[PDB]
Amino acid sequence: AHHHHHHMVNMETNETFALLDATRAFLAKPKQMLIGAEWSDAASGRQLDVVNPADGTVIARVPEADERDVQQAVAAARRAFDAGPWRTAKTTDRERLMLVLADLIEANARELAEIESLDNGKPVMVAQGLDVAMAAQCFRYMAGWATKIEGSVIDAGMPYLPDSEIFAYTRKEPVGVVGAIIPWNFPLLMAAWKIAPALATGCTVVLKPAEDTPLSALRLGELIQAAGFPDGVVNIVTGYGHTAGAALSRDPRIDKIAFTGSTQTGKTIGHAALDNMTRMSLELGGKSPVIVLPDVDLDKAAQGVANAIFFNQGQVCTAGSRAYIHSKVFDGVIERVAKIAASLKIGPGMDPATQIGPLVSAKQRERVCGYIDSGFGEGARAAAGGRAIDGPGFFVEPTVLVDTTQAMRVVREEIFGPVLVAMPFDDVDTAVQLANDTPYGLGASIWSNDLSAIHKLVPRIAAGTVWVNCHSLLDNALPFGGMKQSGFGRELGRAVIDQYTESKSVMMNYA
Template identity: 35%
Template structure:
């Protein structure tokens, strides 16, 4: 079996103590992960701090090339990484699965290379010169989740390094193996100490996020954990980027064609088996088309194979871990008890692992847990409405505000409604599509700060105003 190791200061660090990583497709082992300690966190931060002294003063061209080199080395090792990712995360290789994720890693790293943060001249006349410069922050702590571990890792790593910072990344203990290998590979094109990785139990996270020598924390995960990260960072007033939970609403206006939009609805809700922060979690459908939408959505969804990530016929894979599976099953059971109607799926099969069927729940209502809570799995509640004002009010009632969508043939009308949605991103006739140049982030309890593009790059800098 492959031996996995941490990378600290450019060196391979093995541990005698390890923990088992579960393959969610089988319930068996995906591999043994090194169990890091507080001393390992301290060593990684120290290495990053030392490397920062030189990396922070490298030229813009050197940092750009580093991102290009990261994209190239990820492409060279994409097959290896995608195989490992599929094994520990569960997503199949094909379609919008593991290979798609590795492609996203390459695109984001390459795109980040071309971003610019020019000096902004505020004043330049015979009275004097005022310039605004962007400066790197220092050591960045990256805490990544288990749903898109590599792509989200690159979302954190690439802009941090491009801006002149150094990084210590801690992946989720559910999916640490692919990140360990990715960081090892990336270290072949980066100076020692610029990128380090520590793995271990969840209680190592606060050690990293509260560390006195960490200048910024970037975290992707649940809202509740994000609050804990924020608290741990408060002691030294660290900069924060928090991309947290979402309970995204989609609103279908009465002029849509249910059959025509069924495929779009499917991928909006069920990409990565619904385990995506910005996928659609609630669907509001006008009464006049409600039954037709349910029928066409279920007909399309019924043809999609959910199974083992190792099965080349699988389009979608399992729920990643047992705790999340239990939550999904509990929410479905509660919805049925509250009078909701299952029109597809509902109960898992006797297959090994954490495989759960795609589930559509009709006659769901606001106030049910399946509607009010983020299910983060392959289940979607469909809520009936008669007045679009009521739908918008219900959609905006959530404490979360990551994404939202409006679906209609009348784009102008849809845009007006979309701009009333309380969410960081909003889509028309689609949901969840991300672009490396388009800013992304949540409002309300879906997070703080912005990722992607120039606005996201700025999050890894501080402003220094020069008066001359």
């Protein structure tokens, strides 16, 4: 006889979870882009599907914008900056409107979390308590900068000019029109990170959400209108990176491009920007190390290592994807991390029991599993996990690989999924060499309670953010961004505000 195989899948007896009425209404109605004063379809009429990654089904459709639509959005943002009421708005007007928007996000937080969970796949509880809460706080925090942007008054020596009578100062002007392109891993939160500093400084914005996760950005557009922002201050265009995204990057009428994504796509974006002398901020790839010193509590360290990689299914630019653990405690820590990994509840994001959702798309599952297979092919072994899971969602097991070396693809390359590589080290100099042995430099963490060792180590790790006894932890007051091939520029804090302004020096001879 011939072998006959049946993959056990019952979508039919699969459990369902209640949604708010508002969430259902938003999903049911026709979706459009926000272009100037109008909600609009694409000129072509084309649309793209929005897929729930828990079950592979289509939940919505959004416009598929081409260059024509992007050019219209840019034209609107230009007009709003060059001539509308936004141009003459008081600092206090911008502050007020942003504060209203932060409250509106909070008032509609569960709905936004459900939309985000359905579209992106992440656990709804995490979307609500982290993503949506911090999106709101980002608008509130930046609102307060709107009234506090200060230039400098300079006492110029003018050493070559006798009896000089010079009055000299700097002004911080909005950079202008900002094109913002964001990834799919934190759709609402990343939208907030790009839009909020723009609004606070008096910029206008064309936002291109990721093709895989357009919905929360569209709902945020509704809240922006409800908050009272003038038309064209925020415009939102949906579509493919290779068409809509690229067109935004090449438009000579933007003044700044703000991009988060892969290093490869970031370079493409930057080369387009440069040809127009467009300013650029680039938050790019990572392969962030987690260094565990031998003085740690083993359970705390293991929970820390597990969280550092598996948070948001490893779909985090600063995911702690390489663990270097001192040889005195390596076996105990890794044994514990594997047990944690195998215990994580895998399921749909709308189930409150779920700790690990699906990946965002089939393409992402294909990439991630391809990396895992590559590791096996080079001699790595799985202490936990290792496959794709059957069924129509895009699920992958939390995976921990050991017996890896620095030469392997899984160690060198960003996987962007729930895959850890873990290796021992015998001394701190070696841990430093291993940790910096990457083209990237986005994040890193150190796990220890040893003051001397921590302070000797922090300066030696080439990363934009170094955490101690935590990882991928955010606050609106603390800037975030890359060194090395992880890009340049900073999100959040006072820093981002300065990066959405252009400094004008003024020097008056009043003699």
